[PDB]
Symmetry: C3
Subunit: 88 residues, 3 copies
């Protein structure tokens, strides 16, 4: 069994769908034409997601969890980086 998370933005629209399969999370993308594979590739058994626009710039936060460890991954216009999130 796979586990999914999804977010969207604009009126086109843009959609992003994160799938946790056998300990690896991957990303599928839609921008008003076809579905394609996105840059996001990280380890996880469980995923959630949220996003917001600042003007016309999209920002995404993905919460990947393995055992009891949860890692935030940030997209802000160029590539994916680790975020300051702590489970405290």
């Amino acid at each position: 069994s796979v586990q999914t998370a999804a977010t969207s933005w604009g009126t086109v629209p843009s959609i992003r769908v994160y799938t946790a399969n056998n300990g690896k999370i991957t990303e599928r993308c839609y921008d008003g034409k076809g579905w394609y594979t996105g840059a996001f590739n990280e380890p996880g058994d469980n995923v959630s997601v949220t996003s917001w626009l600042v003007g016309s710039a999209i920002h995404i936060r993905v919460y990947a969890s393995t055992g009891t460890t949860t890692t935030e991954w940030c997209y802000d216009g160029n590539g994916w980086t680790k975020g300051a999130y702590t489970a405290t």
Copy 2:
């Protein structure tokens, strides 16, 4: 154990809550009065959801997953149809 997904829109507001129970996903709806059962009824062990408005017209996408198969279901103003999503 049951597994849920939720989305909302407007300021009333409107809420939709999708519950995966014993391999069947069902929908519960709120539009500012009571909670009622919605049209959505499909197979799944796991669910996620997202939605957006074009003017006052709502569009919903639900991602129902059994085993390794994930099926997208589209609402766009009259009834539910299969979408172009592929894993």
Copy 3:
């Protein structure tokens, strides 16, 4: 064996991350400074969440599920209360 759900709002932004661990759901909060522990503390094995603004006032709904029972929890400016949601 943790399970997460996330929501966000505004352009700062504000983020809320709900974690289901060993039958207890807890909340972590971000408002543009640090990550801190939030007021939300309720029983559950599974969680989902959604939120909306009326002007600058946030409203949050969290769906906490144990076995076949799902309980709605409402935030509307002034702590957390049970909501009218039923699963039938």
